[PDB]
Design a protein around this ligand. Structure first.
Ligand SMILES: *Cc1ccc(-n2ccnc2)cc1
Ligand SMILES: *Cc1ccc(-n2ccnc2)cc1
Ligand SMILES: [Cl-]
Ligand SMILES: [Cl-]
Lengths: 236, 9, 236, 9
């Protein structure tokens, strides 16, 4: 890769600079280079990796949705033929999004996940794996769509099993995992009841564990609990 | 339905 | 170029889609392809070209400023040596910004400007030429900085001379040109008095011509007049 | 000091 000649520490420093500059494509390339150095990632380094790619794919997903909406209106009854351009350009963005998801999944598979032994790292990477298969599932339509969905489900499920055994109910990674798995249930798996049950149980068990936390940990946990509550308000 | 925004830090 | 196989009309259609999707790099590449078809650009097409590159270079300038600020703090008395990384990454962004400016200037020179005979197109392209030399001037420090500044000045001046002869004082292109030339005077040429005089005279002469306009043209002109007023309020 | 924002349309 093009980052093979840069020091690991310099890649990390520049990823932090790119975040300050809101240059998320650069940030993702720097963190990909840092991963490819082959050493495990620290807690802060895992966050940098996640933030970088979440922003990149987030822009791609927002663009894909704009274009998919235009395409669907064009294929309505009474619409004028505009030619192949809207489909072509949606496919363009879709292919670029899939390429980014494949890149992240490749980093997790080679070899972040197999070297991650602590609950905090292993759950973090498995949550990421579920998320990026979820993003692939959002655009999937072919022979493999069901397999993509099950790959997301399987990664989320393994992360959940570990987090329930190894982490307190208020752990922010455990909470964010449950939040995203509930969104998977609602948006991808057509299981809104499973989504609601998971969000409620996650919220109630975190509520009952708040008394054990410092003021700073309380702030971290209650922030994500409010996202669970926001979804429950939208879903019920 | 919101996932972890996860866009900062 | 990679757009040589796409129809001109398809490039224009996709540039409009990219704007809706906020995919400004794509938008700029589509419009570069449309320019390279060799036909003159319509009023709407010129706007698409301008919007695309203004957004691309706008993100680069915002990033360059963030990084230049970090670099200047690092080179202060009492700061810890962080190594070459901040300078290296600022240079990275700077070089990419210069490449975009060179690309736009190349399109204007080959061959938009020489084929532009109407006042509305010629002033529009010369304003663009002044703007992109201004962006080069913002980052310039070497043997050529004075020549870059004079290239910006010369393009703006030719656009001003044409606009004063050929356009009413309320014309939005004439107003936006005067606005940006006044920013050039203030920010680049160290001539704040020239900047203030130009903004005031531009505002007063537009004010006196508003009575000739329709309600829609009045809205277009008064919007840019308010930007002139905002600057005058900041400068005086 | 603001130039033409010119980022829309
Ligand atoms: C996936 C994920 C979980 C939790 C956080 N977070 C935000 C603030 N503290 C922890 C981010 C991402
Ligand atoms: C350079 C420039 C001048 C004027 C406009 N404008 C905005 C709205 N109407 C006209 C944009 C760019
Ligand atoms: Cl395309
Ligand atoms: Cl760099």
């Amino acid at each position: 890769g093009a980052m093979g000649s840069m020091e690991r520490a310099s890649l990390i420093q520049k990823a932090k600079l790119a975040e300050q500059a809101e240059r998320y494509e650069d940030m993702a390339a720097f963190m990909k280079g840092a991963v490819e150095k082959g050493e495990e990632l620290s807690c802060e380094e895992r966050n940098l990796l996640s933030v970088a790619y979440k922003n990149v794919v987030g822009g791609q997903r927002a663009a894909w949705r704009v274009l998919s909406s235009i395409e669907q209106k064009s294929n309505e009854e009474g619409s004028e033929e505009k030619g192949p351009e809207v489909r072509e350009y949606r496919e363009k963005v879709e292919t670029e999004l899939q390429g980014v998801c494949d890149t992240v999944l490749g980093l997790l598979d080679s070899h972040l996940i197999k070297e991650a032994g602590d609950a905090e790292s292993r759950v973090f990477y498995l949550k990421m794996k579920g998320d990026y298969y979820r993003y692939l599932a959002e655009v999937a339509t072919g022979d493999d769509k069901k397999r993509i969905i099950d790959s997301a489900r399987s990664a989320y499920q393994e992360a959940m099993d570990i987090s329930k055994k190894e982490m307190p109910p208020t752990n922010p990674i455990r909470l964010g995992l449950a939040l995203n798995f509930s969104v998977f249930h609602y948006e991808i798996a057509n299981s809104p009841e499973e989504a609601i049950s998971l969000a409620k149980t996650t919220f109630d068990e975190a509520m009952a564990d708040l008394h054990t936390l410092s003021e700073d940990s309380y702030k971290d946990s209650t922030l994500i609990m409010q996202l669970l509550r926001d979804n429950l308000t939208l879903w019920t | 339905a919101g996932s972890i925004p996860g866009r900062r830090s």
